[PDB]
Symmetry: D2
Subunit: 123 residues, 4 copies
Amino acid sequence: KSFGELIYTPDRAEGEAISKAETHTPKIEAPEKVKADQPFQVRVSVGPHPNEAAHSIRWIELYFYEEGRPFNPVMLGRVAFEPGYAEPDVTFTLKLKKSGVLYAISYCNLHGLWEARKEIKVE
Amino acid sequence: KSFGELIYTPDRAEGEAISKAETHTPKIEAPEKVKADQPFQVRVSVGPHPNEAAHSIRWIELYFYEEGRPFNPVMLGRVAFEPGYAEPDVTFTLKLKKSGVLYAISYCNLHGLWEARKEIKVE
Amino acid sequence: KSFGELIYTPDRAEGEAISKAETHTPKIEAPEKVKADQPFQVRVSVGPHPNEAAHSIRWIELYFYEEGRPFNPVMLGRVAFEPGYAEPDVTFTLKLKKSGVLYAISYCNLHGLWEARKEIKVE
Amino acid sequence: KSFGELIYTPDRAEGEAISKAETHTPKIEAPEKVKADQPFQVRVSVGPHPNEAAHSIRWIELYFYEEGRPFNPVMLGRVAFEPGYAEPDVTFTLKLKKSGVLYAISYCNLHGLWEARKEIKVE
Ligand SMILES: [Fe+3]
Ligand SMILES: [Fe+3]
Ligand SMILES: [Fe+3]
Ligand SMILES: [Fe+3]
């Protein structure tokens, strides 16, 4: 198996048995359209999910596929959360110059890597 | 010199020459009082400051001194920002059980480590 | 595109034009066979590749697919390197209980995410 | 209290009661003298110390005070370890241009931040 194959895509996440008990797939909130170079908020959150030393969303990575860039993706940010203190809920502020796709990857110490994605238009 | 001594405290930050050109000391926004186990937002931001490959706030660490805990501090979260895409501005969601002090530490690739602190009461 | 698809697999890495100029695919050095619970070294390195503020291997993530684990992978470690000071070369010390596959993912600020993988037998 | 004051210095570490049970102060192995721009290894390790989900050295940060640099320190690298899989033992490869002081900061989820320091001469 390739590393990429191991990641739970949002289409496959829906049919997982664990998903009946808890949610790992990130929710990405962001404007569908933004102006170039103008700051906007992106909120990423995972839940409901346990948040304890033995089981929690340890971190979230935010990436961006920039349309037309010769190589992709760009990592935009990464946030790590202390189990039992910080909820897996973060807001970033970004500025973009070109349209593309935002990817949020969450990591659970028990349940692996889960992906969310969201198109964003820059005009 | 100890490592701790190298960090720019908010009282010393005020008199630094670089501070006339740009701000490194984090701003922490958080309720003065919260209820135990109830989620609340903490916003940490640094600015105005350059945000480019050659010079940016690379990351922010959020720590907590918990009054009465036998050892301190607890790291609550850490966020890294891609230069030129992500602004050094983050919102966390926390739950606390005991009163203490929030510390935000920012890192600039040119200008080092800068500290902000803020008391928080849990009742 | 899924996030997983974006990652440069070691089979695809070979035919990339950029690979004629520089190497992004991690080299993983690790024993083929180890004893359960006994510490061993894993060395991960990327090169030759530029190492400057404007272009460097920013970090490496080490993951493990554990055969028989209900969910995968487990993140084993992550290391970030200061451009121009630290070379993208790290040695970890691990203990494993079960056989599986080590994955090393490198990130270049210009050229994206590149994967290496290596089987490890635990007896 | 300032954030810097909270960090356990190597002189204070010696007299801590917890230090009779386990070691948090990093050991830094590095040449006393190196040539400018020539790669060398720095090994940082913490132990003996528990390594489990509930209690482990979560990460190590490596910093450098560069003599003559207008601001300090520079972060050289940071490594995070999965509890129960990775031992808190890392080797970095560095290149330096100027003399200074290496600082290693370890973090324990129960016992806080502990400092080690080591002079390095560049000739
Ligand atoms: Fe989970
Ligand atoms: Fe600065
Ligand atoms: Fe590259
Ligand atoms: Fe400890």
